[PDB]
Design a protein around this ligand. Structure first.
Ligand SMILES: *CCC(=O)N1CC(Oc2nn(C(C)(C)C)c3ncnc(N)c23)C1
Length: 306
């Protein structure tokens, strides 16, 4: 009873990309930055190229993420531009120039205002609510997997763990999971739901309000299941009014259904962003903020080929 996924998978000539530099080779794999110039179009699109870190049927998992990324279209979700089928299979996506939100919140923590924090909360809840519309469970929502296009615009990324549900619960089998972001049911029963992502959304909000603190810092991930059963949660961050912390606490409730819906999280944080200093107490509420031949540079969000 599902609709045909008529998304288009664009195969891109390795010749179309130029000026490729290195952006990082962390746990996400070797990621490059560069310019994608579609032949005979006179546009230069800043892109990120990612190959997993050979030909060891890891080539299989990278196509799984491309499938998901090619099937999403939302201003707060990173969309796949295309894949390059050279010796390595590469994901080509829109370049998010300011990097992950986790490193951004750390490196600019003395210049992030309550307006920015509450707005990021709205945008992530809009992206997640879109992923819920498309019957998609992210299973890896964290501040590290939210990229920053501009300080005013963030998008959810990294769909390696993402899984598409039929027409409610998903049962994983094994492998490295981010324990400190998962709902209790995801830890004990390996059940994942849109409401399991709400728990992850809660930990993601806690990362921002603490300006990039490590959740459950210095405590072995094997202990996490037990202390969460004892009724323990993450602490109230200093800048957080009880209003904002009460929303985070609601995301970590043991009854998965009595947790907030992503559509309800948009509404509450939207109302809060209407008056940010009433809900986030931050000292000094502040402002926030590529090579020469740039005449034909078009950001990917304005390059729309149907
Ligand atoms: C927060 C540190 C970090 O995770 N990263 C910096 C590096 O940048 C980066 N990674 N990707 C993907 C493709 C691996 C998700 C990007 N896509 C787009 N733009 C940037 N800057 C990306 C990841």
């Amino acid at each position: 009873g599902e609709a045909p996924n008529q998304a288009l998978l664009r195969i891109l000539k390795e010749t179309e990309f130029k000026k490729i530099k290195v952006l990082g080779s962390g746990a996400f794999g070797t990621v490059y930055k560069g310019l994608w110039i579609p032949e005979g179009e006179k546009v230069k699109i800043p892109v990120a190229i990612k190959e997993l870190r050979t030909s060891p049927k890891a080539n299989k998992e990278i196509l799984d993420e491309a499938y998901v990324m090619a099937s999403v279209d939302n201003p707060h979700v990173c969309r796949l531009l295309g894949i390059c089928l050279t010796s390595t299979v590469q994901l080509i996506t829109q370049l998010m120039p300011f990097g992950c939100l986790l490193d951004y919140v750390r490196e600019h923590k003395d210049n992030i205002g309550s307006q920015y924090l509450l707005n990021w909360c709205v945008q992530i809840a809009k992206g997640m609510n879109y992923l819920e519309d498309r019957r998609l469970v992210h299973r890896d929502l964290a501040a590290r997997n939210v990229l920053v296009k501009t300080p005013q615009h963030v998008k959810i990324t990294d769909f390696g763990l993402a899984k598409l549900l039929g027409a409610k619960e998903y049962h994983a089998e094994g492998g490295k999971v981010p324990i400190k972001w998962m709902a209790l049911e995801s830890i004990l029963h390996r059940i994942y739901t849109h409401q399991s992502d709400v728990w992850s959304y809660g930990v993601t909000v806690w990362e921002l309000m603490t300006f990039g603190s490590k959740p459950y810092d210095g405590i072995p991930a094997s202990e996490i299941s037990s202390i969460l059963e004892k009724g323990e949660r993450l602490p109230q961050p200093p800048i957080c009014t009880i209003d904002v912390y009460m929303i985070m606490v609601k995301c970590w409730m043991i009854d998965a259904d009595s947790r907030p819906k992503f559509r309800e999280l948009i509404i509450e944080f939207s109302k809060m962003a209407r008056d940010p200093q009433r809900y986030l107490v931050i000292q000094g509420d502040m402002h926030l903020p590529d090579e020469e031949d740039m005449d034909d540079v078009v950001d990917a969000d304005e390059y729309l080929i149907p």
